Short mmCIF file of C-alpha atoms and ligand atoms in Angstrom, two decimals:
data_model
loop_
_atom_site.label_atom_id
_atom_site.label_comp_id
_atom_site.label_asym_id
_atom_site.label_seq_id
_atom_site.Cartn_x
_atom_site.Cartn_y
_atom_site.Cartn_z
CA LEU R 1 116.53 161.69 40.42
CA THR R 2 116.01 165.43 40.72
CA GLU R 3 112.49 166.74 41.09
CA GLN R 4 112.64 168.19 37.57
CA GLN R 5 113.93 164.88 36.19
CA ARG R 6 110.80 163.26 37.67
CA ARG R 7 108.72 166.08 36.16
CA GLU R 8 110.10 165.28 32.71
CA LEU R 9 109.44 161.53 32.79
CA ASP R 10 107.25 160.77 29.78
CA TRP R 11 104.44 158.84 31.45
CA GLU R 12 102.05 159.54 28.57
CA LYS R 13 104.41 158.02 25.98
CA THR R 14 104.77 154.97 28.23
CA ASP R 15 101.05 154.81 29.15
CA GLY R 16 101.84 155.16 32.86
CA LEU R 17 104.15 152.10 32.91
CA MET R 18 107.83 152.98 32.63
CA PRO R 19 110.35 150.27 31.62
CA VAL R 20 113.18 149.98 34.15
CA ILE R 21 116.53 148.32 33.52
CA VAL R 22 118.17 146.90 36.64
CA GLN R 23 121.96 146.62 36.33
CA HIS R 24 124.44 145.34 38.90
CA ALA R 25 126.00 148.50 40.34
CA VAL R 26 129.50 146.96 40.54
CA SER R 27 129.90 144.39 37.78
CA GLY R 28 127.63 145.89 35.10
CA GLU R 29 125.67 142.66 34.62
CA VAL R 30 122.13 143.37 33.43
CA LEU R 31 119.86 141.62 35.95
CA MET R 32 116.30 142.26 34.76
CA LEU R 33 113.75 144.56 33.18
CA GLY R 34 110.61 145.49 35.06
CA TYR R 35 107.94 148.20 34.89
CA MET R 36 107.13 151.07 37.26
CA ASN R 37 104.25 153.48 37.65
CA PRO R 38 104.70 156.81 39.49
CA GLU R 39 103.93 155.22 42.84
CA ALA R 40 106.38 152.38 42.21
CA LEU R 41 109.11 154.86 41.33
CA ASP R 42 108.29 156.89 44.45
CA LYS R 43 108.37 153.82 46.72
CA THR R 44 111.66 152.87 45.08
CA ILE R 45 113.16 156.25 46.02
CA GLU R 46 111.78 156.29 49.56
CA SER R 47 112.59 152.71 50.55
CA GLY R 48 115.88 152.23 48.73
CA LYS R 49 114.53 148.90 47.41
CA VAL R 50 113.56 148.32 43.78
CA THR R 51 109.75 148.40 43.63
CA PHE R 52 107.70 147.52 40.56
CA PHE R 53 104.09 147.86 39.50
CA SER R 54 102.75 144.34 38.81
CA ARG R 55 100.06 144.48 36.14
CA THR R 56 99.36 140.80 36.94
CA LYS R 57 98.42 141.27 40.59
CA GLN R 58 97.68 144.96 39.82
CA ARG R 59 99.70 146.04 42.84
CA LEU R 60 103.06 147.36 43.92
CA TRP R 61 105.59 144.69 44.75
CA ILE R 62 109.02 145.18 46.25
CA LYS R 63 111.30 142.80 44.37
CA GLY R 64 112.09 140.21 47.03
CA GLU R 65 108.66 140.38 48.76
CA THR R 66 108.28 136.61 48.37
CA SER R 67 111.82 135.44 47.60
CA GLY R 68 114.07 137.33 50.02
CA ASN R 69 116.19 138.62 47.10
CA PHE R 70 116.02 142.42 47.24
CA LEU R 71 117.72 144.99 44.98
CA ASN R 72 119.29 147.85 46.96
CA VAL R 73 119.14 151.07 44.94
CA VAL R 74 122.46 152.75 44.19
CA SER R 75 121.51 155.06 41.33
CA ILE R 76 118.57 155.94 39.03
CA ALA R 77 118.81 157.73 35.68
CA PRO R 78 116.53 158.39 32.70
CA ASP R 79 117.54 157.96 29.06
CA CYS R 80 117.87 160.79 26.50
CA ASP R 81 114.07 161.02 25.82
CA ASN R 82 112.78 160.21 29.36
CA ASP R 83 110.83 156.97 28.69
CA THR R 84 113.15 154.35 30.26
CA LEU R 85 115.01 154.26 33.55
CA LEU R 86 118.34 152.67 34.44
CA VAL R 87 118.63 151.58 38.09
CA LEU R 88 122.06 150.56 39.31
CA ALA R 89 121.47 148.22 42.28
CA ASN R 90 123.21 145.74 44.60
CA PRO R 91 121.38 142.40 44.72
CA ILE R 92 121.03 140.82 48.15
CA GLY R 93 120.85 137.28 46.82
CA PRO R 94 120.25 136.00 43.28
CA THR R 95 117.78 137.94 41.14
CA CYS R 96 116.24 135.22 38.94
CA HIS R 97 113.92 132.44 40.18
CA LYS R 98 116.20 129.94 38.40
CA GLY R 99 118.86 130.38 41.08
CA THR R 100 121.19 132.52 38.95
CA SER R 101 122.37 136.12 39.05
CA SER R 102 120.64 137.37 35.88
CA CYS R 103 117.25 136.83 34.28
CA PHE R 104 119.14 136.83 30.94
CA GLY R 105 120.96 133.56 31.56
CA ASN R 106 124.48 133.10 30.29
CA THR R 107 124.99 136.02 27.89
CA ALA R 108 127.48 138.46 29.40
CA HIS R 109 129.71 141.34 28.32
CA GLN R 110 133.39 140.41 27.98
CA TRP R 111 134.64 142.23 31.07
CA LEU R 112 132.13 140.42 33.27
CA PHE R 113 134.38 137.36 33.10
CA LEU R 114 137.05 139.15 35.15
CA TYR R 115 134.51 139.84 37.88
CA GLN R 116 133.31 136.22 37.74
CA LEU R 117 136.89 134.96 37.94
CA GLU R 118 137.45 137.01 41.08
CA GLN R 119 134.24 135.67 42.58
CA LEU R 120 135.38 132.11 41.93
CA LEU R 121 138.82 132.81 43.42
CA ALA R 122 137.14 134.36 46.48
CA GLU R 123 134.95 131.31 47.05
CA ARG R 124 137.96 128.98 47.04
CA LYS R 125 139.34 130.87 50.05
CA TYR R 126 139.24 128.60 53.10
CA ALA R 127 138.19 125.54 51.02
CA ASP R 128 140.96 122.88 51.31
CA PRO R 129 144.14 122.54 49.31
CA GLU R 130 143.40 120.00 46.52
CA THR R 131 140.05 121.53 45.55
CA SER R 132 142.15 123.71 43.22
CA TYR R 133 145.44 125.41 42.48
CA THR R 134 143.85 128.47 44.12
CA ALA R 135 143.15 126.74 47.43
CA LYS R 136 146.71 125.44 47.60
CA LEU R 137 147.99 128.96 46.94
CA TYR R 138 145.81 130.16 49.81
CA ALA R 139 147.32 127.45 52.01
CA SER R 140 150.89 128.42 51.05
CA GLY R 141 150.50 131.62 53.06
CA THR R 142 150.73 135.26 52.08
CA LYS R 143 154.48 135.18 51.36
CA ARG R 144 154.28 132.59 48.58
CA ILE R 145 151.34 134.34 46.90
CA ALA R 146 153.16 137.66 47.03
CA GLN R 147 156.20 135.86 45.65
CA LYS R 148 154.16 134.82 42.61
CA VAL R 149 152.84 138.35 42.08
CA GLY R 150 156.46 139.54 42.17
CA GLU R 151 157.68 136.85 39.78
CA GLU R 152 154.84 137.39 37.32
CA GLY R 153 155.41 141.13 37.35
CA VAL R 154 158.99 140.41 36.36
CA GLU R 155 157.91 138.04 33.58
CA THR R 156 155.41 140.63 32.31
CA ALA R 157 158.05 143.36 32.26
CA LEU R 158 160.52 141.15 30.40
CA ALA R 159 158.05 139.87 27.79
CA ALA R 160 157.02 143.45 27.03
CA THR R 161 160.63 144.59 26.80
CA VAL R 162 161.34 141.77 24.32
CA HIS R 163 158.19 142.77 22.34
CA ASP R 164 156.89 139.19 22.43
CA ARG R 165 153.21 140.19 22.39
CA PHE R 166 151.90 136.63 22.87
CA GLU R 167 154.09 136.05 25.92
CA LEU R 168 153.09 139.47 27.27
CA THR R 169 149.42 138.47 26.95
CA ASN R 170 149.94 135.25 28.90
CA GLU R 171 152.20 136.67 31.63
CA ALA R 172 149.83 139.61 32.06
CA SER R 173 147.12 136.98 32.54
CA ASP R 174 149.22 135.22 35.18
CA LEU R 175 149.87 138.53 36.91
CA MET R 176 146.15 139.36 37.07
CA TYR R 177 145.17 135.91 38.40
CA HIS R 178 147.75 135.99 41.18
CA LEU R 179 147.03 139.64 42.03
CA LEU R 180 143.35 138.75 42.47
CA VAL R 181 144.32 135.92 44.82
CA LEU R 182 146.72 138.16 46.75
CA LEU R 183 144.05 140.81 47.24
CA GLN R 184 141.55 138.21 48.46
CA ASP R 185 144.18 136.84 50.85
CA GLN R 186 144.46 140.30 52.43
CA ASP R 187 140.66 140.84 52.63
CA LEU R 188 140.61 143.17 49.62
CA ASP R 189 139.35 142.96 46.06
CA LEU R 190 139.72 144.45 42.62
CA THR R 191 136.65 146.66 43.25
CA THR R 192 138.56 148.39 46.06
CA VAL R 193 141.52 148.89 43.67
CA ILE R 194 139.32 150.30 40.88
CA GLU R 195 137.70 152.71 43.38
CA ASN R 196 141.11 153.86 44.59
CA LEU R 197 142.07 154.40 40.95
CA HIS R 198 138.85 156.35 40.35
CA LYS R 199 139.54 158.76 43.21
CA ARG R 200 142.81 159.54 41.41
CA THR D 2 117.81 130.55 18.60
CA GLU D 3 115.29 128.72 16.42
CA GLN D 4 113.38 127.57 19.47
CA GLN D 5 114.26 130.81 21.29
CA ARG D 6 112.43 132.91 18.70
CA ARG D 7 109.63 130.33 18.52
CA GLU D 8 109.25 130.92 22.26
CA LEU D 9 109.45 134.72 22.42
CA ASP D 10 106.22 135.97 23.98
CA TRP D 11 105.11 138.30 21.20
CA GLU D 12 101.49 138.31 22.42
CA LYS D 13 102.33 139.45 25.96
CA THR D 14 104.22 142.48 24.63
CA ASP D 15 101.50 143.44 22.10
CA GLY D 16 103.86 142.62 19.22
CA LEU D 17 106.59 144.99 20.53
CA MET D 18 109.50 143.49 22.49
CA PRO D 19 111.62 145.72 24.76
CA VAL D 20 115.30 145.45 23.84
CA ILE D 21 118.24 146.40 26.05
CA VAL D 22 121.40 147.28 24.15
CA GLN D 23 124.55 146.78 26.18
CA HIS D 24 128.18 147.24 25.13
CA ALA D 25 129.56 143.79 24.32
CA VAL D 26 132.95 144.52 25.97
CA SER D 27 132.53 147.04 28.75
CA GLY D 28 128.99 146.34 29.97
CA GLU D 29 127.74 149.93 29.70
CA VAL D 30 123.99 150.04 29.01
CA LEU D 31 123.66 152.08 25.83
CA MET D 32 119.94 152.37 25.12
CA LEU D 33 116.52 150.77 25.25
CA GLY D 34 114.61 150.19 22.01
CA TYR D 35 111.68 148.10 20.73
CA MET D 36 111.53 145.36 18.08
CA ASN D 37 108.70 143.71 16.19
CA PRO D 38 109.38 140.25 14.71
CA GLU D 39 110.64 141.72 11.44
CA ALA D 40 112.96 144.10 13.30
CA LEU D 41 114.51 141.14 15.12
CA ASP D 42 114.73 139.21 11.85
CA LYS D 43 116.47 142.15 10.13
CA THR D 44 118.75 142.50 13.14
CA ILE D 45 119.75 138.84 13.05
CA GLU D 46 120.29 138.70 9.27
CA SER D 47 122.06 142.06 8.90
CA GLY D 48 124.07 141.96 12.14
CA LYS D 49 123.08 145.60 12.80
CA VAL D 50 120.58 146.53 15.53
CA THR D 51 117.21 147.24 13.88
CA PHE D 52 114.21 148.62 15.79
CA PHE D 53 110.57 149.31 15.01
CA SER D 54 109.66 152.92 15.81
CA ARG D 55 107.20 153.03 18.69
CA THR D 56 105.62 156.35 17.68
CA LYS D 57 104.50 155.14 14.20
CA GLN D 58 107.55 155.53 12.01
CA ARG D 59 108.31 152.15 10.45
CA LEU D 60 111.40 149.91 10.75
CA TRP D 61 114.65 151.72 11.46
CA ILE D 62 118.26 150.48 11.49
CA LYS D 63 120.04 152.19 14.39
CA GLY D 64 122.40 154.63 12.70
CA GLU D 65 120.58 155.16 9.39
CA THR D 66 120.37 158.88 10.38
CA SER D 67 123.75 159.35 12.03
CA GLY D 68 126.23 156.72 10.83
CA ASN D 69 126.41 155.34 14.40
CA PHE D 70 125.50 151.67 13.98
CA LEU D 71 125.49 148.83 16.51
CA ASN D 72 127.10 145.53 15.44
CA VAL D 73 125.35 142.55 17.02
CA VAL D 74 127.45 140.22 19.10
CA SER D 75 124.79 138.41 21.08
CA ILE D 76 121.04 138.21 21.72
CA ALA D 77 119.30 136.57 24.69
CA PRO D 78 115.77 136.48 26.09
CA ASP D 79 115.07 136.98 29.76
CA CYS D 80 113.48 134.13 31.70
CA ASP D 81 109.82 134.75 30.77
CA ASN D 82 110.71 135.61 27.13
CA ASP D 83 109.36 139.21 27.09
CA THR D 84 112.59 141.22 26.92
CA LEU D 85 115.78 140.83 24.90
CA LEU D 86 119.31 141.69 25.87
CA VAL D 87 121.49 142.54 22.86
CA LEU D 88 125.24 142.77 23.31
CA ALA D 89 126.64 144.92 20.51
CA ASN D 90 129.72 146.89 19.43
CA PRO D 91 129.01 150.51 18.50
CA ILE D 92 130.63 152.13 15.47
CA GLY D 93 130.01 155.76 16.37
CA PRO D 94 129.30 157.46 19.79
CA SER D 101 128.10 157.19 24.37
CA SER D 102 125.15 155.99 26.45
CA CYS D 103 121.63 157.38 26.24
CA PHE D 104 121.58 157.23 30.09
CA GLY D 105 124.02 160.05 30.89
CA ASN D 106 126.85 159.85 33.43
CA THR D 107 125.65 156.76 35.28
CA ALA D 108 127.99 153.77 35.23
CA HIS D 109 128.61 150.59 37.19
CA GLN D 110 131.82 150.74 39.21
CA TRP D 111 134.02 148.50 37.03
CA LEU D 112 133.24 150.60 33.97
CA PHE D 113 135.75 153.08 35.36
CA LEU D 114 138.59 150.63 34.68
CA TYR D 115 137.53 150.39 31.03
CA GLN D 116 137.35 154.16 30.76
CA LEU D 117 140.74 154.60 32.38
CA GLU D 118 142.21 152.36 29.71
CA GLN D 119 140.58 154.48 27.01
CA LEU D 120 141.91 157.70 28.49
CA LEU D 121 145.38 156.17 28.85
CA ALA D 122 145.33 155.38 25.14
CA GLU D 123 144.29 158.99 24.45
CA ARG D 124 147.30 160.17 26.48
CA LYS D 125 149.84 158.68 24.14
CA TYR D 126 149.59 162.19 22.61
CA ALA D 127 150.04 164.44 25.68
CA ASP D 128 152.81 166.75 26.94
CA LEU D 137 155.90 157.30 30.58
CA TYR D 138 154.97 156.50 26.97
CA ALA D 139 157.75 158.68 25.55
CA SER D 140 160.36 156.99 27.78
CA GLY D 141 160.24 153.60 26.00
CA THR D 142 158.89 150.12 26.65
CA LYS D 143 161.75 149.50 29.09
CA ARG D 144 160.82 152.30 31.50
CA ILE D 145 157.17 151.20 31.66
CA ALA D 146 158.20 147.57 32.17
CA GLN D 147 160.47 148.84 34.96
CA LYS D 148 157.47 150.43 36.69
CA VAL D 149 155.48 147.20 36.33
CA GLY D 150 158.29 145.11 37.84
CA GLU D 151 158.94 147.52 40.73
CA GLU D 152 155.30 147.81 41.67
CA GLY D 153 154.96 144.04 41.56
CA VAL D 154 157.75 144.03 44.13
CA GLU D 155 155.97 146.72 46.22
CA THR D 156 152.63 144.91 45.99
CA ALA D 157 154.29 141.70 47.17
CA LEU D 158 156.02 143.43 50.09
CA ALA D 159 152.95 145.39 51.24
CA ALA D 160 150.78 142.28 51.20
CA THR D 161 153.52 140.40 53.04
CA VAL D 162 153.55 142.85 55.98
CA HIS D 163 149.71 143.08 56.00
CA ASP D 164 149.44 146.83 55.33
CA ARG D 165 146.12 146.81 53.42
CA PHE D 166 146.11 150.58 52.73
CA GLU D 167 149.54 150.56 51.11
CA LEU D 168 148.62 147.32 49.34
CA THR D 169 145.52 149.04 47.92
CA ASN D 170 147.62 151.95 46.65
CA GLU D 171 150.32 149.65 45.25
CA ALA D 172 147.87 147.32 43.50
CA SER D 173 146.36 150.49 42.02
CA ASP D 174 149.75 151.73 40.74
CA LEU D 175 150.39 148.23 39.37
CA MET D 176 147.08 148.09 37.46
CA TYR D 177 147.55 151.59 36.06
CA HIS D 178 151.05 150.90 34.81
CA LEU D 179 150.05 147.47 33.50
CA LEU D 180 147.43 149.16 31.34
CA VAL D 181 150.05 151.64 30.13
CA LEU D 182 152.41 148.76 29.22
CA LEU D 183 149.74 146.74 27.39
CA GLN D 184 148.76 149.81 25.37
CA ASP D 185 152.46 150.44 24.63
CA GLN D 186 152.67 146.96 23.07
CA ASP D 187 149.42 147.31 21.08
CA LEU D 188 147.43 145.17 23.51
CA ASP D 189 144.78 145.96 26.13
CA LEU D 190 143.15 144.49 29.21
CA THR D 191 140.29 143.07 27.12
CA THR D 192 142.80 140.79 25.38
CA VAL D 193 144.11 139.67 28.77
CA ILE D 194 140.57 139.10 30.09
CA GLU D 195 139.75 137.01 27.00
CA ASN D 196 142.97 135.04 27.48
CA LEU D 197 142.03 134.25 31.09
CA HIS D 198 138.58 133.31 29.78
CA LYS D 199 139.89 130.64 27.39
CA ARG D 200 141.83 128.96 30.23
MG1 LIG V 301 153.86 151.69 43.45
ZN1 LIG V 302 113.93 156.13 25.42
ZN1 LIG V 303 114.25 135.64 36.14
ZN1 LIG V 304 153.84 133.49 34.31
ZN1 LIG V 305 110.87 134.31 35.37
ZN1 LIG V 306 110.63 139.58 31.38
#
C-alpha cells in the first residue's frame, strides 16, 4: 500500500471499519473476512501479521493472538472504489476455529482441487506402502516414478495425435498425478514450477 | 440452504450481508458487494449475482448497467454466518482489486494467453509436433529427476507444463477439464 493509496481509503463510507478479505497467497482459497480500522491496518503493515479491529472486545487483535494461527502478510490491495481491502497471506496453521483451512467450509473454486491433490500426495510421502498407491510409488524409488512420468507423457502425446479427446483427458490426468508425485519425491512442488513459468 | 438462510445472521450485519465474489474456476477474487435478504433471494432464483446498493440506490443485478453479469455457481456462509462467499462465472470483464493475484492464478492466466496465441506470428506445426514436445519433455523430466538435478528438473517440469497446456488447447481441451477429471477420481 502506497501512502496515497492509504490516503484514498474511504473510511467515511465504511464508518471507520474497513472490510478485509484474506486470501491464501498461493492457492487462492478465501480464508476469512474481517474488519480493520486505521490503526489495525497500520499494525498489519508494520508487523507483517494480519491485525483486525474487534468491535466485540473493542480492541486490536492480531489474528492468532489466542490460537497460534497467524496470517503472514504477502500483499494488500484496495478495490476500485477504495472501501474493501484484499490481503494475500500465508497461514501459519489453520485459519478457522473448526480445525479447517477456511472459514467458508467446503466451497472451493475448481482449481483449488489441484492444490489439494498435491497436498494429499505430499502428506503420503514417508507414510508406508499400503496406505495408498502414492506411498507405494514413493517406496519404488525415484527411477520408477520417473518411469511413469515418461510413460504417461508418451500416452498423452499419442492420444492427442490420434485426436481421442477422452483418452487425452485421462492420460493428461495420469501425467499430472505422477508429475506431482515426482516433484514431491525430489523436494519440489508445482508452486515452484508455476513460479519458474512466471519468471518466463 | 434452507437452514443456511434461516441461520444467516441478518441482525448482526444490520440487514446488509458482506458478499465476496470469487471466480468459480480460477479463484481470483473479483469484488465485494452487499446483499439484503431480497438481494440474496433474487440471486438464488435468477442465478445472477444481485446486490443491494449500500449508498441508497435500491436492488441492482450486477451487470444491469454494463452487460457484465455474474452467473452463480455456489454460495456459502462463513462460520459465524455474517459473510457469504459466492463462486460465480463472469460473462463480461477483470478483478476490482487490480494486479494482485495468488500465485497459482498465473497458471490459469498462462493458459488464457496461450489460447490467445493461436493467432500470432508450435500451433501451426500440427498436433504431432506439440505431442512430440510433450513426449520429449516427459523423457527429460524423468531423466533430470532420476539424476537428482532439481534445477534442471524445475526447468523441465516447467517446459512440460507449458507444452501440455499448448497440446490440450490444440485438442479443444484445457487444464480445467483435466483438474475436474482428477477430481471425479
Ligand atoms: Mg524441456
Ligand atoms: Zn468497493
Ligand atoms: Zn472460522
Ligand atoms: Zn495413463
Ligand atoms: Zn467462527
Ligand atoms: Zn464472519
